[PDB]
Write a protein that binds this ligand. Sequence first.
Ligand SMILES: *[C@@H]1O[C@H](CO[C@@H]2O[C@@H](C)[C@@H](O)[C@@H](O)[C@@H]2O)[C@@H](O[C@@H]2O[C@H](CO)[C@@H](O)[C@H](O)[C@H]2NC(C)=O)[C@H](O)[C@H]1NC(C)=O
Ligand SMILES: *[C@@H]1O[C@H](CO)[C@@H](O)[C@H](O)[C@H]1NC(C)=O
Ligand SMILES: *[C@@H]1O[C@H](CO)[C@@H](O)[C@H](O)[C@H]1NC(C)=O
Ligand SMILES: CC[C@@H](C(N)=O)N1CCCC1=O
Lengths: 420, 592
Amino acid sequence: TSILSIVYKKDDLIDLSRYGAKINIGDRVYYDSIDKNQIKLINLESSTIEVILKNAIVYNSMYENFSTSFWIKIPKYFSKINLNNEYTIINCIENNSGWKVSLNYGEIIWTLQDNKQNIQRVVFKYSQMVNISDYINRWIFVTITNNRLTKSKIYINGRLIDQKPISNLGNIHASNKIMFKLDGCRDPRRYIMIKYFNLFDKELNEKEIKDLYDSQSNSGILKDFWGNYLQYDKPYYMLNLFDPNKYVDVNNIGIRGYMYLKGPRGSVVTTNIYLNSTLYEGTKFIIKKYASGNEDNIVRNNDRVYINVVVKNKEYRLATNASQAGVEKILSALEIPDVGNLSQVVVMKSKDDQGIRNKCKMNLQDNNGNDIGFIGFHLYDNIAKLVASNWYNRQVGKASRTFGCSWEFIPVDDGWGESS
Amino acid sequence: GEAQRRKEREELAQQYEAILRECGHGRFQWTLYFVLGLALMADGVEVFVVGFVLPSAEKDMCLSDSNKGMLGLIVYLGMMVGAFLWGGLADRLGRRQCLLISLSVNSVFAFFSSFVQGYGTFLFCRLLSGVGIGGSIPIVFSYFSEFLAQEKRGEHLSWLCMFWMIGGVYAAAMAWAIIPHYGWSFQMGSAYQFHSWRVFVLVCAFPSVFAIGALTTQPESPRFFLENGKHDEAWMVLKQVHDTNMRAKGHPERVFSVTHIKTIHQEQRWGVRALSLGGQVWGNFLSCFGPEYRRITLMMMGVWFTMSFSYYGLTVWFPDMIRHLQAVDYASRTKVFPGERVEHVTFNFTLENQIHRGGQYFNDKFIGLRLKSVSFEDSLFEECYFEDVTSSNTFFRNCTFINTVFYNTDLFEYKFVNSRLINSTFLHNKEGCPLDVTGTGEGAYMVYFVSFLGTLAVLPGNIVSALLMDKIGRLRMLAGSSVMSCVSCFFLSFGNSESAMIALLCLFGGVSIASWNALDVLTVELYPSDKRTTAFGFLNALCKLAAVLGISIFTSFVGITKAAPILFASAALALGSSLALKLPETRGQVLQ
Ligand SMILES: *[C@@H]1O[C@H](CO[C@@H]2O[C@@H](C)[C@@H](O)[C@@H](O)[C@@H]2O)[C@@H](O[C@@H]2O[C@H](CO)[C@@H](O)[C@H](O)[C@H]2NC(C)=O)[C@H](O)[C@H]1NC(C)=O
Ligand SMILES: *[C@@H]1O[C@H](CO)[C@@H](O)[C@H](O)[C@H]1NC(C)=O
Ligand SMILES: *[C@@H]1O[C@H](CO)[C@@H](O)[C@H](O)[C@H]1NC(C)=O
Ligand SMILES: CC[C@@H](C(N)=O)N1CCCC1=O
């Protein structure tokens, strides 16, 4: 049911579908080292991806429903130059007729234009004043459905954001060639990322789109704050989803010193461009592989690893005393040789028992494979102290709302632009 | 019917005078004088507390405007409610009973407010304390008067106004001796902090407790017993007075000759009792506005209202204007530096009262600097770095920040007025109030000194009024003092320096006190013994309401002109004096 499916291969891009669409790529198109299947497009002329379909699959009907899907990453807009700068990213428009996706300040737009130059637009809007954003500089699954008889709809990560009737529109033509380049951007240093572009000749429903989202989500592999692959031997800042205005911090070194959530988080401001909350506050959490036999640096689910703590540019280890008072017992950072037999083994957990994708959670386990439990925070005398507990596991067993068993990894990225 | 009641009341008044003349003046009267003086010193103290603690409480409880102004005028709304309520209740329950209950309420809620952390809670506590201390002046004057013979009533009642002065002197001295020690940071509970102004509040509560202690050892006034049909214990109280007096004199052998006393003939449960009390008090109130007392009561309303309005207006106005003049001098001394360009260099310094304009600082780091009333205008900071910065009354208006970092600074978002920040980060912001809270330092000593001088100015008038009240008369003294107050009000313009305001404050305070004395004596003397506390307390409540209105009005006009306060004060006092000359003469009469 798929007509175009651009997928990475050995130093090239191919089409999974049985149509053999011609592909040509510019000399300035980049690829991520770890996840090469993601494509980076900079604001230049040579940064071009041309893919040409066949004449038998060119959209030239008037009752033909069709859908598209892709993953997109849009960095932060830093200055006023990006305001009111609607710039195109994908065109299938010839003779002023076709379909086009474009980006504006906090906006992603689908545009259809028939032979009569009638323009229909669907928009997705995300703010930039928020403390922590779910869309800025983070991967987004965008899919668009077009039913010529009822409506055209937008789905962001499988949920409905906007719909507009298109019954008024007449015959819509399409270009034989389809476009990947930043067109109409005044900003000389604005780039995007795009991957997993798929086209279907029918209107997809909620169920199929949710299935596609889950399939392409890579639920079996851990993801960071920016939606990329989690890697070992790299410093990550730490965020608690339920209490995101505090950061991991230390006070004293060793067992007698406790790691806690200190706040509040600071701010980055640009006077009516963005007023986000600082994400580079606190102490880094490096991940060290222990028993994962995989050669690659990618962290997978159920992996058993170790976690370094960077305090005054010195690397310590997570451990807690297994034998102490209560289940919500205090974790600590220790000098790397003096761990002894303290519980240090941590299991990475991304998807649940049923396989439904959720955020990163770490489960402290001992040498004997006994679950100390999920890592989180609990309040002791008004201090949010870090503790590993099986209480989270108990609520998971009871299908209750766990409180604090979810962590988020934030590496330093160029798309955020914060000053360390 | 009415004639019979009038005859009975007159007979009781005449015989009561006779019994008091027999008992005589001596130790009993002086003992009661000291006790009731403490009760009045408490009310003297209570009117200074919030004004002395507001400079510290504004920082300690994050007090905005429309909150400082209210806390100021709260001791007066509470006194307004309390005066009426306890004055009305004192004629059905007794003077000493109601005095104990009101003083106890005052003491409790002052103690509570000493520890309260919030603002609304502090408002409520300080309102109830005002309610409690509201009923002090009416009960006290009406209570002491019922033990004095007509020979020297004005002289002996006027001495009772020394104590209110003493209360203010106490307040000022304790504020001077306690508040200046800002270091005291007693810690009991991490979330709470105990400063020196709270200690001041506690020590201000003390006088009221001492008042209750003293009062418990005095007897209810015999007159109240006689009106309410209770004959035996009125007899016993009069016997006690006679016994104490004569034993102190040196003749502990003579006998109380009075055997029978004329007494006014008397003609769900909780709710019924409350309704009955309310009905009786309402009756006493309206009987105060009866045919026999309607002219007197309206002249009394006029005199009380006009005097309170003028006095409170000017009393709040003089410190206001002194602060205004200080401000003007400070603003005159301000230094200006228009334009300066700075390259890589470290800046530590402390600047006070400065304006830097058109600055251009490029990659400058600001470590460990204190700003007091320093404004940066039309400046450009680029790759700057602010660390360990504490600022009072500091603003950045029309400034542009580029790639600057504010680390460990209390530069909140209200100190950047119409600024433009680009790629700027705020890290580890210091704890402070969301809005400007201003700052008061070394200038509190002079505030305490000024208060002290106000009270001391009051002293000569008290002495002279007490000595001449019976020789001259209440109407003459009231008039002669209100007129001089009006003249003093006219002389206000011949003052624009701080020293001038201090001298003028002293003059006005020294002049108005005799008028206030005379109006206290007159108001006691002019009402029957079954309505004295009710009437006195309704007039005192009116006094407090006038205080609220005059404080508001006269503080509204500070720094605007010196014509509005002079005109308002002079007009009010002239009308007060005019109305006072139309009141009936009460000297050389039995207390009826
Ligand atoms: C605001 O900052 C961004 C990111 O730059 C980072 O953050 C700054 C506060 C400062 O610490 C820089 O050294 C950091 O690199 C700027 O956007 C980037 O600018 C750099 C130039 O150094 C350029 O190489 C990147 O391509 C830019 N990225 C994008 C997506 O444009 C931005 O220029 C700053 N804002 C303004 C108004 O200049
Ligand atoms: C602070 O620095 C200034 C110059 O920036 C210097 O004159 C001064 O001596 C310093 N103070 C101390 C205590 O060193
Ligand atoms: C500062 O403010 C004035 C108006 O308030 C404006 O004209 C001026 O351009 C500003 N300063 C600079 C250097 O831009
Ligand atoms: C106790 C005295 C009291 C009064 N009612 O006379 N005073 C004196 C100055 C202002 C005031 O209310």
